[model samples]
Target chain A: RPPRKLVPLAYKQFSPNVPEKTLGASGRYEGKIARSSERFKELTPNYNPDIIFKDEENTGADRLMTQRCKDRLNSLAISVMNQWPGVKLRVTEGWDEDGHHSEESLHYEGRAVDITTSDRDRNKYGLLARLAVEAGFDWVYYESKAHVHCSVKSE
Target chain B: ERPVAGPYITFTDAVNETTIMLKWMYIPASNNNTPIHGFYIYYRPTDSDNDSDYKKDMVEGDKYWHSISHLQPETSYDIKMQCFNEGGESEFSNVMICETKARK
Candidate 1:
């Protein structure tokens, strides 16, 4: 017998619900992906060519993300590719606690991802925020001229 | 900061046997609102057995021209680049295909 499909969530948390300007949304900021780099493939066991994990901001940052976050990230990558051809989704931050961040930053728990805003990806800035919500992420934040922050529900 | 817009391949050619010179547009961070730490260069022989095995190198942000050396005396190398900073690396730019000079 085929398993029943799960229903989608009715609403998602946007930065406005809480805010990046300060600590808000509670668990909204915390997260975790992998056909990707060898390091990601080995650690995540699930990544995409459209998505990449690269923490150039923190040389000594950790690179581990939860499985739940990884799954959602994969889904987002698929959407990104579908929305735009030749656009690769890049992650600048994941599972990083060593770098500078809010004390309650979800990064400490590896429950968040920061999608890079490369010039080539400028076209998808606003679209990424909405897509993250549809992709089953728990929270979405469109950082100013910076990146798209997304988080998934923790197990 | 947003990732840099990849530099444009302004000029490229084989300077001499086993060497190729590459030049790209220089965009200041003040203009793009993104600081560049350097650039990553990817090169490999075109249509090779394993095209994925690309060799990479980096040049400081201060320079826009770099010489890729120790190449085959006579060969075409597929070159690409991405400017990077603490934020992240830019998506690789359009491929820049150039040839190396003949062997002496």
Candidate 2:
């Protein structure tokens, strides 16, 4: 599978506006989500084996996401493992609508996910930010020492 | 409150040759206050007088204390802190000096 092209990489000291959008998991997108032959497709038989889902807030929000969001996340996870080989990656926030967020946060639309970078290494945060872009995330923020907050392009 | 005041740093401790631990009092503190969103730490080598020599960073209010690392061994640094909320950042705190330990 060929790597998908993404918008130019952008970095920020703070979060960018997440703009409201149609929930991709809504009956509309669920009818059929876009598919690609990306490596994440082959990285795991269930979601992405290289990537683990563990929402930090424990709000019990659905782990569901847009095909676009999941694909990019799977690619980003594979990229992280490729860089460090034996590291673990956990998704700390996924598809949340029952939690605190800016009025326009993309998590409500299944377009964003936050991944933990804890204990990986001192350089893990920034490296994850860079790889997220290569994996086709449209907005990537090294939000803190703990995690990277990223969103995917609309399909 | 619409306006917030700088936090009072009660003490600064050298955790090691490269790390400094900071603790402070906030909200109607002995120094002054409001509900803080977070705090900003500003520091520099004690002998440096230029603004550019100062390193400024922040920590969220989830914790009452913070740490700064990646500093030179056996060096004295001047540090200050201020808290901020939706209103904005407060004035700088009283400067406190702490010296990093030897790298032994």
Candidate 3:
């Protein structure tokens, strides 16, 4: 499939029991997948992706927490893909904590994820996105090549 | 006064040809008698099941970023943070998760 579009970088947070269910899960923030110039390695046993790429607002907390959430989301994506096949659920943009605050971003608190990979039809991996949405996730879309972002609800 | 709580720390799972970077937002305590000594951060292995046993510190400098070159692929993690100084440690913030990308 072709490369997908970047997630516009939008997000919202609310309580899980709010009933509105409008804000999805509270975990709406993207982490930093890479630094300015770090070597890309698979995030598994014996591989560390720097986890601390400094940006303009380098305080350590953003990077640290973002990494924690990304690690969790990445694990879930991998597990899902394993059950399926050829699921190119890659990471387009992880975290820009302060930057990119649009009307549709789950990356507000670094607990959100945007899948940058898609399918053969030049569309996003709808099946996988659906799986996530069905599992109580919100604000999932396939705008780019094949992308879908999900977040954990916060109180 | 006290430092305002700033939730939503940012992070990244993996990057192309580099290390997986993480990020977040933290507020320092109110400037009191002292200028504020430093900050504290905590972390754990993304793949470890034991979330209780993790690493933490009270660094002298108030840095916003941390770098790590050693990590596991397809692992999960939980992280919490707090700030400190001559007075004491700040309240522990909420916990966040980190999941590394899978290797091809």
Candidate 4:
């Protein structure tokens, strides 16, 4: 399948101003709830179940992303890997834990991911940032050089 | 406040060629304040001759990390870091060793 494009208006509808639209139990995105793709892996070196919201039975292992988020993220990873062979991505943090984020963080909603950045792809930070925004991330920011936080405006 | 204290350093990653990246955290301050202006990275190959001088570079404090390039492949390198501010320089961080990848 070709890469997916972001329908900005569809997502913008759930802006923070409309809290109800943004906050909810993780649901089927287009009738699909979860997904598994080899393009990307959702596990981090340190996995903490307590960091995730227990509202859904998302196995608390690899069950943190909605189908759409996983598809978009995996697409981005595939594109990057295609361009730079042997490049690997590590999602250091996803979903959430208590001490790691703000009350308004989207990880709680299963719409955010933290991608690790290192000297391995040091020069690609800007490119990754660009790819993330183009991939329809509502916002992409460097939380220091350790990780890049990307999230959709809504689920 | 006195000079910023040595940062906690870690070897993050390195390319198979000549580049290596390192991260430093916990910039200590004598006055219990964050007065760090920047940090200095000093590195040398472990096999360097006694007369070899360490390569040095400085980065803004907020950077907290740096990638050094133009290193020899398949060689082990030693690195240390220290923070500085208006007060002065702090003690050096513990030396961290990084082994570069060998090109196939």
Chain A, candidate 4, TM-score of: 0.55
Q: How big is the positional error of residue B17 in model 1, measured in Å on the Cα after superposition?
A: 46
Tens digit per residue, CA lDDT, model 2, A1-155 = 33333342233432233422333321122112112324213222226667766432223433567687788877777776666667756675666533234445666556677675434453556666777767777667765444577776555
Ranking by lDDT: 1, 2, 4, 3
Question: What TM-scores do the predictions have?
Answer: 0.44, 0.43, 0.36, 0.37
Q: Candidate 4 lDDT, tens digit per residue, A1-155?
A: 34333332221233223332233322222221123443234323223322222111123432366455665566566655554555544454455432124545566556677663323354565555555656556556654333466666443
lDDT of 1 at B68: 92
Scoring the B chain of model 2 against the true B chain gives a TM-score of 0.85
Docking model 3 quality class: incorrect
**Winner on lDDT (2 vs 4):** 2
Each prediction's DockQ?
0.03, 0.02, 0.02, 0.02
| Model 1 alpha-carbon miss at residue B43, Å | 25
Q: Show model 3 residue runs off by greater than 4 Å.
A: A1-155, B1-8, B12-20, B24-34, B45-51
What Cα-based lDDT does every candidate model obtain?
0.62, 0.62, 0.44, 0.54
Q: Residue by residue across B9-59, what tens digits does model 4's lDDT show?
A: 754467666888988776354538757888888887643323246788999
Find the 10 residues in a row with the least total lDDT in model 2 chain A. A25-34
Ten residues in a row with the worst lDDT in model 4 chain A? Answer: A49-58
Residue lDDT tens for model 1, A1-155: 22223332222336436654334432443222221334333334234556655533223233466787788888877776666656656675676533234556676566778674334344456677777677776777764334567765555
Model 4 in CAPRI terms: which quality? incorrect
Off by over 4 Å in 2: A1-46, A56-62, A118-122, B1-104
What DockQ does predicted model 1 obtain? Answer: 0.03
